[PDB]
């Protein structure tokens, strides 16, 4: 029978923020297609999901891929009306060590993607007069890291995109907005020392780090009716680590 | 049930605030400027809220209102500071009075309630300020210095505020409206509704809904780990 | 005879950052009015400026002296067309030992102040089709600090006040401007030990406190020719303390 | 003196910012697309400046252009990173092409000329690199996503690069022009024109000089404490 219910992308599903993303727009009641970078990945989302979603391979660098995968989704499941584009890939230097492949790969799987995967589903969202694109930024497009010049570039290039994308799709009532996290525990976060996670977390109003499942309350939130006349801002989830 | 106060109540934004907080499982306690709209308020609210009368401006009613919720309901765990009034002139004509008496209405009485219910959260370790900003504390408009100087104040004050309380899980947080619909723009003309709409990338005005969507959204658990921050809800009238 | 200079008044000009900025004018070639909050503080403002500026007394929380000023400066030196409103008086408390005179004071001397000069000077400036607004905020109008919830409330809507301006009066050619100082070497900080001045530095990408001439000199920009076509913008300056 | 390399000196802001800071005393190396260009910039500065012709898409040519400056007049210690060409279209008509072309003349020019002047600045403990940003890094402008990614780009870039330098006393920022009166804004129409400076608050087109005085602030000592800032020059069309 036919997939009848409202179809998000959610890239870079595997684990922590997209993860918990994916998860609870499954819950809201979408049809979930997840992303991961390899086959493998991409089966795991599958038995994860269930039969109210699907996992793909996505190299999200590959202009094929995406255009393959969205194919591949519309031909299956359906238009897809929620987009959430969610990378935490970095490569950090300070700029005397970045290198040419430093800098474009992060500017190709960070802001490269969400030109393209964006330029590709308006269609299917101008056709439904409805449409959702969420775009996972960070605190430091705002707050200065050295070292990331890069990610910094790349994310805050992201939400000047959205502000554009929101100006050009609002008559159409598609809202387009960025989130953008600050310390949340990941993998990434777990593996470093208790001493050091104290450190970030004194840095934070409320005093922890956040998880996962704030940024994606944060999401469900811009993906529902109760933020249909929100569009073109970045929504700051950080516990007050970056206020103004 | 853990208690809400959302002052200005009565209609628009306020009165979509406080019934959402009903529909939430808030105990809502509105204020209204007259003991008749107050009434009203608990004609409305029934057993799930209560209407008190509060004029803003005045210290000795502030304490008075949050004594009597505290004493009858319990602590006020949710404040909501909503205010919509205006005194707009260009500057050249704006007086001391329509200065002072926005600066109290919308700045000065933040401050005032937000310090009165901190003991309460405090001690709950449990607490969410809410206040009303405005599109115009970030996009100029002229005539409205006052008002877009105090929601500015507002949002700083806010930022301070949310350092200070954040280790008792307290989050202090702004909404900006842009243009909504109320009665003061419905009785405006269709050719000035239209230029404002023209300015908004949705091409429409919001509802109070809207708003109430956007306080629902910080009042609750899915807006834990977020403090300190404007809430923009414009339809990209302006975007940051 | 007859003075001929345009006239600049500089509020808060005994010491620090307003001092600075008042000789830097006068370098600069205004007529400098600088205020003091006593009348023997305004007689050592009128020994450093000789001839080419006076000290008046002034306490900017009363509507009757501003106006009693700005009159005796019209009616002996000539229209007010630089504006620098200065003050750094401080009440801090964490909110919950925050009084209301904590409040009001700091409130009044700051935002209140700022309406009340600017109101006065706007029939100059518009019939000069000339003038310079310069509003001296900080960086805790977007930093937040616990304990100030007056002084950034009251800075912050300084800087929205001078946005509503600036487009008021535009037409006119009249810029209203805000400079945020960051950690600049004042008595007060002075009065802090080594230790912690280095730990403010450390804080600074520049890697140091910076200097009431370094607010002098931006002031000085946005008072001439150069900062033509400026105007309701916020000059930060504060060695990269903070910067988005 | 010191060398100043200022890109995109041909016409327009870039010409005025190469002439200004000849006048405040710096060597100035200007850069043109072509090598008639760049002779005509030679025939401009005379002693106190150089032309030279860099198509700044290509990294060895960035790399030959610096050497050549390091060997003949000395290091670069105030680079500006100035484009501004377009490639303006809805998303839905914007080709990879658009998109990429501007990305690399703008943002991975300031990368790649950024990173190249680093050795001489730290020697020096003294630098100043000013990027060319716009008012459309802040304000959206449909049809030109490629040009306001690019720019809030370089000024995410400028932030972090100012906090890896700026103990070295370098500091790096973005000026941030407006509507600015060049041959492609005299191109236009009376009433297209007209719409423009009836959304900047001084009511006016802005002039290159009024972007060359921004820059010569900064690149002196009168802004030795200013850095990772944004310096808006848009007569009030954006205020923040």
């Given at each position: 029978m036919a997939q009848e219910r409202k179809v998000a992308l959610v890239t870079?599903?595997?684990?922590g923020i997209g993860a918990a993303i994916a998860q609870q727009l499954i819950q809201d009641g979408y049809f979930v297609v997840g992303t991961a970078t390899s086959e493998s990945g991409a089966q795991k989302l599958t038995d994860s999901f269930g039969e109210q979603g699907a996992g793909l391979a996505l190299d999200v660098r590959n202009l094929d891929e995406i255009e393959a995968v969205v194919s591949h989704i519309e031909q299956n499941?359906?238009?897809?009306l929620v987009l959430v584009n969610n990378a935490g890939i970095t490569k950090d230097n300070l700029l005397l060590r970045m290198s040419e492949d430093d800098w474009d790969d992060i500017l190709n799987i960070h802001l490269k993607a969400v030109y393209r995967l964006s330029k590709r589903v308006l269609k299917g969202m101008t056709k439904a007069r409805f449409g959702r694109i969420i775009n996972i930024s960070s605190v430091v497009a705002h707050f200065a890291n050295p070292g990331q010049a890069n990610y910094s570039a790349a994310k805050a290039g992201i939400e000047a995109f959205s502000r554009s994308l929101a100006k050009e799709m609002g008559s159409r009532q598609i809202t387009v907005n960025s989130v953008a996290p600050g310390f949340i525990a990941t993998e990434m976060t777990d593996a470093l020392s208790e001493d050091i996670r104290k450190k970030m977390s004194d840095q934070v109003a409320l005093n922890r780090l956040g998880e996962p499942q704030d940024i994606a309350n944060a999401v469900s939130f811009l993906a529902?009716?109760?933020?249909?006349?929100?569009?073109?801002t970045v929504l700051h989830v950080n516990g007050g680590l970056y206020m103004a």
């Open positions: 870079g599903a595997s684990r499941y359906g238009p897809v529902s009716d109760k933020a249909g006349y929100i569009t073109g």
